[PDB]
Amino acid sequence: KFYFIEVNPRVQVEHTITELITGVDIVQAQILIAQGKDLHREIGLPAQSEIPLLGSAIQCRITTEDPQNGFLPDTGKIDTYRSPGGFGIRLDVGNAYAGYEVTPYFDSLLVKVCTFANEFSDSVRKMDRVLHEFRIRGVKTNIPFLINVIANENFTSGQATTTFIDNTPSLFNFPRLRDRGTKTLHYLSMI
Amino acid sequence: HMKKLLVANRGEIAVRVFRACNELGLSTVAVYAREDEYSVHRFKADESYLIGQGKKPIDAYLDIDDIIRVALESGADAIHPGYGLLSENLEFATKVRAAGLVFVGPELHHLDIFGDKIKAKAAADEAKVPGIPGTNGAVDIDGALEFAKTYGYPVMIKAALGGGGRGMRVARNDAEMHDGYARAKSEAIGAFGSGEIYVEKYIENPKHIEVQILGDRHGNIIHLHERDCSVQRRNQKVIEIAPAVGLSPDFRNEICEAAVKLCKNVGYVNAGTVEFLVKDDKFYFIEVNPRVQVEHTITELITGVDIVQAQILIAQGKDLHREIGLPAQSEIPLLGSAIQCRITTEDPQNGFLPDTGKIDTYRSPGGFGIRLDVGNAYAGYEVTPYFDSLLVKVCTFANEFSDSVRKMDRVLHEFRIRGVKTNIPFLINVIANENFTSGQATTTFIDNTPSLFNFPRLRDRGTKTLHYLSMI
Amino acid sequence: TVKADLEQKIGYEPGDHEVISYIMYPQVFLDYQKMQREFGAVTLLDTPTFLHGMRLNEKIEVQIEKGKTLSIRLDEIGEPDLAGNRVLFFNLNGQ
Amino acid sequence: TVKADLEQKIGYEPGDHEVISYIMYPQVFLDYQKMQREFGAVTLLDTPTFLHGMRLNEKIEVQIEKGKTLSIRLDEIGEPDLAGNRVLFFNLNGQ
Ligand SMILES: CC(=O)SCCNC(=O)CCNC(=O)[C@H](O)C(C)(C)COP(=O)(O)OP(=O)(O)OC[C@H]1O[C@@H](n2cnc3c(N)ncnc32)[C@H](O)[C@@H]1OP(=O)(O)O
Ligand SMILES: Nc1ncnc2c1ncn2[C@@H]1O[C@H](COP(=O)(O)OP(=O)(O)O)[C@@H](O)[C@H]1O
Ligand SMILES: [Mg+2]
Ligand SMILES: [Mg+2]
């Protein structure tokens, strides 16, 4: 039983996964429609039953919210930034480069990463690989929280609800990270 | 049984196999020479070990015994060689399988039947695959002249071992084959010792078609699809597209079925690539690559199949359809088209010689339909003349080929590498060409087009301003 | 009781040796744990690097664990600002 | 005749003003063209920046074009090496 709750009259943050699973450039089609062009005559989009479903996709927003600090948006200087890549990985970076000073003025978002695959389990595995490969140091991120949500069996089954995060306290248990390079550089600079 | 894997390679392909192994839940082991101590792939793995101490940093990656020793000491269950170096080396495969380590590759029988083009052509003709007419086996200079006389002109000089500008000359007029034979034999004995040459009937304006083949130990052999690599400079590929949009679908299906029947005849396993030369609805076998190619990424994008993950799991001895999840041959989809451009340090204003030096700027694009497989191209990286010129290969994929072309143009204009000269203006010129966009580009398309070598003046005003400010 | 209190302090479950060291040297063990949380395992450094730090344009290698070697190069030591902080331009693992 | 000679020396087709500037001051124009290839349009710089360069921690803005303003900050000046080269740690456009 579905019910209407809202319509957002805008392009959304989560349009990237729709682009990945449909093959349709949403922003390009938006601009072409703003040029007064037909969807099927000049843009070239097919009819309704010919729209392809190219596998499944997962979007994770990596922000400066610190899940060990009640998801407060952290600020400071990004001294390290390494972004992953390869097959099935889509990156939409904001302001997350090395040397960037994160300000409390704008939103907490650092980088949007989208993972697409023909099978949802492969998408979950590649998203976990991305979240472990991702390295943002000098500021706190929600990456361990995203890893905990990815590893949950409700997420992988796809039966997560809006109360899934609140009902699961195990998502807020975070393993200790050694971070030996930062500590070694700090000690070397101090001495 | 398999839980740790060593990569006997470097650069971008090592990172690709590391990502595939991490997605497959396996631990990773990297190897690196002393001169590759700042390579990205060293720090992308769980364990990294120095190999080939005291040697030149091309022989260190070719050091079979050191790689075997590192794999045994680190407790790596398997070895993935990537492409190049020891990927097609049969001695490396013998030592890996004899030491008790799984070799991510085809069988040793495939290794020697595809290590030289004479036995590959023999397997192709006994597989009833239409090959290219030419001399049979090891012929000498007099046999070269004999084939040039009866079969006519033009002919192509090709050695059995290697290629890609190594022992591959041309002959269109008399008394050219003698010095071509001498040069090809000298290049052969420079690298692999005495190597036989077979003279080939040269083709005017051919199209180069590669077919990617995935086969397991259970005998299930499927082709993902084919890719067109005809855009070539001095017979070296620069831009690869997938699928061949300039060919009719039934012809491409027939070429793929021919490659499937050849690989089924030789009982092929793991990942491999069958190369063809194509002219007016007639294809001719050339060679089989018994490994993964540099341009497997466009095949992955247009098929949705992770080639490296599949070949790791095939090395784990799993079935292609029940265990991997790959569908039937007819159920393999075609997700639009994709274009791969390799951004290297070859400076097109200086005869495509690879530039060296420090990279002071690196900005990479992203967004919809962009795939990045970076090597060592970060800011602050000092480019050495020891290794390959490749910085980062970037693939753009879309539903339509024109959208892929315009996305690739956007990527190449968005890309910024300062400090070393790149082939990006040459790639921009090739992308902008009308033959490439139509997709009917041939092997001689670059050499017959002088307009691809005219480059607009770039006023890098940030670099000039910083240089003047530092000077003052 | 002291095991539970130490787990409350150091943030993880301690071994019997850690509990015993907390019993024998309470302030010293806590200061050592704070130094471990701030500077990491400094025992893996060589003694000249441990004592005198790092020279300009020096190249050192630190083996944190088996198969993991940190390539550290100090390229430039910045001048102190008005707040008294100096920026050290390190080259860690090529970056 | 002199326009074809000038086109080879400067690498592009010269205007009428460039040709007539090459007649009067042939060495000065070619030295100006060489400086244009190395340092670019230094005429857009502010005069204290044109004559004295940059101070440490100074932040300047250079408008090279309409809608394009380079944000240049000098963070640190390196010590000269054995080759006599200094490394200047700039912050161009945030990077
Ligand atoms: C290609 C992929 O699939 S990458 C996926 C995850 N990455 C890996 O599995 C291999 C690299 N491993 C790591 O970077 C870390 O050890 C992780 C991800 C396991 C987590 O460890 P952390 O607690 O967060 O930091 P750690 O204590 O290990 O720091 C050690 C440093 O040595 C680096 N390092 C990691 N692997 C190696 C290596 N084989 N050789 C040398 N240095 C290495 C790390 O990057 C890290 O430097 P950093 O500060 O820039 O991040
Ligand atoms: N007889 C021929 N006619 C036309 N082109 C040829 C002929 N033989 C080889 N070539 C060209 O030489 C290139 C190298 O082929 P191949 O030997 O398969 O690769 P490699 O040299 O990397 O081993 C191919 O792209 C092909 O276009
Ligand atoms: Mg809403
Ligand atoms: Mg070949």
mmCIF file with all atom_site columns, N, CA and C in Angstrom, chain B residues 190-220:
data_model
loop_
_atom_site.group_PDB
_atom_site.id
_atom_site.type_symbol
_atom_site.label_atom_id
_atom_site.label_alt_id
_atom_site.label_comp_id
_atom_site.label_asym_id
_atom_site.label_entity_id
_atom_site.label_seq_id
_atom_site.pdbx_PDB_ins_code
_atom_site.Cartn_x
_atom_site.Cartn_y
_atom_site.Cartn_z
_atom_site.occupancy
_atom_site.B_iso_or_equiv
_atom_site.pdbx_formal_charge
_atom_site.auth_seq_id
_atom_site.auth_comp_id
_atom_site.auth_asym_id
_atom_site.auth_atom_id
_atom_site.pdbx_PDB_model_num
ATOM 1  N N  . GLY B 1 190 ? 67.454 -9.332  -29.745 1.00 0.00 ? 190 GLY B N  1
ATOM 2  C CA . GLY B 1 190 ? 67.654 -8.391  -28.657 1.00 0.00 ? 190 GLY B CA 1
ATOM 3  C C  . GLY B 1 190 ? 66.845 -8.744  -27.424 1.00 0.00 ? 190 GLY B C  1
ATOM 4  N N  . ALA B 1 191 ? 65.633 -9.262  -27.622 1.00 0.00 ? 191 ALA B N  1
ATOM 5  C CA . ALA B 1 191 ? 64.708 -9.531  -26.527 1.00 0.00 ? 191 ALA B CA 1
ATOM 6  C C  . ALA B 1 191 ? 64.642 -11.004 -26.135 1.00 0.00 ? 191 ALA B C  1
ATOM 7  N N  . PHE B 1 192 ? 64.285 -11.887 -27.068 1.00 0.00 ? 192 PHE B N  1
ATOM 8  C CA . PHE B 1 192 ? 64.007 -13.282 -26.742 1.00 0.00 ? 192 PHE B CA 1
ATOM 9  C C  . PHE B 1 192 ? 64.958 -14.261 -27.419 1.00 0.00 ? 192 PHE B C  1
ATOM 10 N N  . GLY B 1 193 ? 66.084 -13.797 -27.942 1.00 0.00 ? 193 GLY B N  1
ATOM 11 C CA . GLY B 1 193 ? 66.955 -14.673 -28.692 1.00 0.00 ? 193 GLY B CA 1
ATOM 12 C C  . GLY B 1 193 ? 66.423 -14.935 -30.089 1.00 0.00 ? 193 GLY B C  1
ATOM 13 N N  . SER B 1 194 ? 66.925 -16.016 -30.686 1.00 0.00 ? 194 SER B N  1
ATOM 14 C CA . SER B 1 194 ? 66.587 -16.341 -32.067 1.00 0.00 ? 194 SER B CA 1
ATOM 15 C C  . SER B 1 194 ? 65.110 -16.695 -32.199 1.00 0.00 ? 194 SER B C  1
ATOM 16 N N  . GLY B 1 195 ? 64.358 -15.805 -32.838 1.00 0.00 ? 195 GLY B N  1
ATOM 17 C CA . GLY B 1 195 ? 62.936 -16.003 -33.030 1.00 0.00 ? 195 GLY B CA 1
ATOM 18 C C  . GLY B 1 195 ? 62.552 -16.019 -34.493 1.00 0.00 ? 195 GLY B C  1
ATOM 19 N N  . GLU B 1 196 ? 61.799 -17.037 -34.896 1.00 0.00 ? 196 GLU B N  1
ATOM 20 C CA . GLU B 1 196 ? 61.398 -17.178 -36.286 1.00 0.00 ? 196 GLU B CA 1
ATOM 21 C C  . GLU B 1 196 ? 60.388 -16.105 -36.673 1.00 0.00 ? 196 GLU B C  1
ATOM 22 N N  . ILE B 1 197 ? 60.423 -15.715 -37.942 1.00 0.00 ? 197 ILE B N  1
ATOM 23 C CA . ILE B 1 197 ? 59.473 -14.758 -38.488 1.00 0.00 ? 197 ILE B CA 1
ATOM 24 C C  . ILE B 1 197 ? 58.605 -15.474 -39.514 1.00 0.00 ? 197 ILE B C  1
ATOM 25 N N  . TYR B 1 198 ? 57.339 -15.071 -39.571 1.00 0.00 ? 198 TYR B N  1
ATOM 26 C CA . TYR B 1 198 ? 56.397 -15.541 -40.577 1.00 0.00 ? 198 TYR B CA 1
ATOM 27 C C  . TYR B 1 198 ? 55.890 -14.328 -41.344 1.00 0.00 ? 198 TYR B C  1
ATOM 28 N N  . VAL B 1 199 ? 55.950 -14.398 -42.667 1.00 0.00 ? 199 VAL B N  1
ATOM 29 C CA . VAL B 1 199 ? 55.569 -13.267 -43.502 1.00 0.00 ? 199 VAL B CA 1
ATOM 30 C C  . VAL B 1 199 ? 54.076 -13.332 -43.785 1.00 0.00 ? 199 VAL B C  1
ATOM 31 N N  . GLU B 1 200 ? 53.402 -12.205 -43.592 1.00 0.00 ? 200 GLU B N  1
ATOM 32 C CA . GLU B 1 200 ? 51.955 -12.124 -43.663 1.00 0.00 ? 200 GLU B CA 1
ATOM 33 C C  . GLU B 1 200 ? 51.531 -11.330 -44.889 1.00 0.00 ? 200 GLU B C  1
ATOM 34 N N  . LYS B 1 201 ? 50.412 -11.733 -45.481 1.00 0.00 ? 201 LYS B N  1
ATOM 35 C CA . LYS B 1 201 ? 49.800 -10.963 -46.557 1.00 0.00 ? 201 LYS B CA 1
ATOM 36 C C  . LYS B 1 201 ? 49.186 -9.701  -45.967 1.00 0.00 ? 201 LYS B C  1
ATOM 37 N N  . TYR B 1 202 ? 49.795 -8.552  -46.250 1.00 0.00 ? 202 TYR B N  1
ATOM 38 C CA . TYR B 1 202 ? 49.366 -7.303  -45.635 1.00 0.00 ? 202 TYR B CA 1
ATOM 39 C C  . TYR B 1 202 ? 48.008 -6.897  -46.195 1.00 0.00 ? 202 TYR B C  1
ATOM 40 N N  . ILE B 1 203 ? 47.225 -6.211  -45.370 1.00 0.00 ? 203 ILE B N  1
ATOM 41 C CA . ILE B 1 203 ? 45.863 -5.817  -45.707 1.00 0.00 ? 203 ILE B CA 1
ATOM 42 C C  . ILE B 1 203 ? 45.786 -4.299  -45.778 1.00 0.00 ? 203 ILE B C  1
ATOM 43 N N  . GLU B 1 204 ? 45.210 -3.785  -46.863 1.00 0.00 ? 204 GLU B N  1
ATOM 44 C CA . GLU B 1 204 ? 45.014 -2.351  -47.028 1.00 0.00 ? 204 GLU B CA 1
ATOM 45 C C  . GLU B 1 204 ? 43.823 -1.887  -46.199 1.00 0.00 ? 204 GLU B C  1
ATOM 46 N N  . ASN B 1 205 ? 44.085 -0.959  -45.281 1.00 0.00 ? 205 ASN B N  1
ATOM 47 C CA . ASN B 1 205 ? 43.084 -0.384  -44.386 1.00 0.00 ? 205 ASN B CA 1
ATOM 48 C C  . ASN B 1 205 ? 42.252 -1.415  -43.616 1.00 0.00 ? 205 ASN B C  1
ATOM 49 N N  . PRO B 1 206 ? 42.860 -2.168  -42.699 1.00 0.00 ? 206 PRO B N  1
ATOM 50 C CA . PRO B 1 206 ? 42.084 -3.138  -41.924 1.00 0.00 ? 206 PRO B CA 1
ATOM 51 C C  . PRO B 1 206 ? 41.513 -2.544  -40.648 1.00 0.00 ? 206 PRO B C  1
ATOM 52 N N  . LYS B 1 207 ? 40.466 -3.193  -40.153 1.00 0.00 ? 207 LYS B N  1
ATOM 53 C CA . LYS B 1 207 ? 39.916 -2.881  -38.845 1.00 0.00 ? 207 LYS B CA 1
ATOM 54 C C  . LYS B 1 207 ? 40.330 -3.946  -37.839 1.00 0.00 ? 207 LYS B C  1
ATOM 55 N N  . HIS B 1 208 ? 40.809 -3.496  -36.686 1.00 0.00 ? 208 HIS B N  1
ATOM 56 C CA . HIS B 1 208 ? 41.289 -4.380  -35.632 1.00 0.00 ? 208 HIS B CA 1
ATOM 57 C C  . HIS B 1 208 ? 40.153 -4.634  -34.653 1.00 0.00 ? 208 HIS B C  1
ATOM 58 N N  . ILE B 1 209 ? 39.751 -5.896  -34.528 1.00 0.00 ? 209 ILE B N  1
ATOM 59 C CA . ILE B 1 209 ? 38.663 -6.304  -33.649 1.00 0.00 ? 209 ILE B CA 1
ATOM 60 C C  . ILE B 1 209 ? 39.210 -7.305  -32.641 1.00 0.00 ? 209 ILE B C  1
ATOM 61 N N  . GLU B 1 210 ? 39.004 -7.022  -31.359 1.00 0.00 ? 210 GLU B N  1
ATOM 62 C CA . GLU B 1 210 ? 39.362 -7.927  -30.277 1.00 0.00 ? 210 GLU B CA 1
ATOM 63 C C  . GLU B 1 210 ? 38.098 -8.524  -29.680 1.00 0.00 ? 210 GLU B C  1
ATOM 64 N N  . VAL B 1 211 ? 38.118 -9.831  -29.440 1.00 0.00 ? 211 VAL B N  1
ATOM 65 C CA . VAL B 1 211 ? 37.015 -10.537 -28.803 1.00 0.00 ? 211 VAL B CA 1
ATOM 66 C C  . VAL B 1 211 ? 37.484 -11.032 -27.442 1.00 0.00 ? 211 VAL B C  1
ATOM 67 N N  . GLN B 1 212 ? 36.754 -10.663 -26.395 1.00 0.00 ? 212 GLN B N  1
ATOM 68 C CA . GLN B 1 212 ? 37.099 -11.055 -25.036 1.00 0.00 ? 212 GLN B CA 1
ATOM 69 C C  . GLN B 1 212 ? 36.418 -12.377 -24.705 1.00 0.00 ? 212 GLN B C  1
ATOM 70 N N  . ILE B 1 213 ? 37.189 -13.320 -24.169 1.00 0.00 ? 213 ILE B N  1
ATOM 71 C CA . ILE B 1 213 ? 36.736 -14.688 -23.943 1.00 0.00 ? 213 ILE B CA 1
ATOM 72 C C  . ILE B 1 213 ? 36.883 -15.015 -22.463 1.00 0.00 ? 213 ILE B C  1
ATOM 73 N N  . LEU B 1 214 ? 35.816 -15.548 -21.866 1.00 0.00 ? 214 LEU B N  1
ATOM 74 C CA . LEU B 1 214 ? 35.818 -15.992 -20.475 1.00 0.00 ? 214 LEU B CA 1
ATOM 75 C C  . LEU B 1 214 ? 35.447 -17.469 -20.446 1.00 0.00 ? 214 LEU B C  1
ATOM 76 N N  . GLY B 1 215 ? 36.338 -18.299 -19.923 1.00 0.00 ? 215 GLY B N  1
ATOM 77 C CA . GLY B 1 215 ? 36.107 -19.735 -19.836 1.00 0.00 ? 215 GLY B CA 1
ATOM 78 C C  . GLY B 1 215 ? 36.598 -20.297 -18.516 1.00 0.00 ? 215 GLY B C  1
ATOM 79 N N  . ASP B 1 216 ? 35.867 -21.273 -17.988 1.00 0.00 ? 216 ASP B N  1
ATOM 80 C CA . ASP B 1 216 ? 36.208 -21.896 -16.718 1.00 0.00 ? 216 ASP B CA 1
ATOM 81 C C  . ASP B 1 216 ? 36.741 -23.312 -16.924 1.00 0.00 ? 216 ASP B C  1
ATOM 82 N N  . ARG B 1 217 ? 37.084 -23.958 -15.807 1.00 0.00 ? 217 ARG B N  1
ATOM 83 C CA . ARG B 1 217 ? 37.646 -25.304 -15.875 1.00 0.00 ? 217 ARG B CA 1
ATOM 84 C C  . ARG B 1 217 ? 36.578 -26.354 -16.156 1.00 0.00 ? 217 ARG B C  1
ATOM 85 N N  . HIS B 1 218 ? 35.300 -25.992 -16.029 1.00 0.00 ? 218 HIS B N  1
ATOM 86 C CA . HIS B 1 218 ? 34.217 -26.915 -16.346 1.00 0.00 ? 218 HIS B CA 1
ATOM 87 C C  . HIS B 1 218 ? 33.930 -27.001 -17.839 1.00 0.00 ? 218 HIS B C  1
ATOM 88 N N  . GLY B 1 219 ? 34.597 -26.194 -18.661 1.00 0.00 ? 219 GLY B N  1
ATOM 89 C CA . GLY B 1 219 ? 34.394 -26.215 -20.094 1.00 0.00 ? 219 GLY B CA 1
ATOM 90 C C  . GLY B 1 219 ? 33.411 -25.196 -20.625 1.00 0.00 ? 219 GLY B C  1
ATOM 91 N N  . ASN B 1 220 ? 32.730 -24.455 -19.755 1.00 0.00 ? 220 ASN B N  1
ATOM 92 C CA . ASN B 1 220 ? 31.830 -23.402 -20.210 1.00 0.00 ? 220 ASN B CA 1
ATOM 93 C C  . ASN B 1 220 ? 32.649 -22.222 -20.716 1.00 0.00 ? 220 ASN B C  1
#
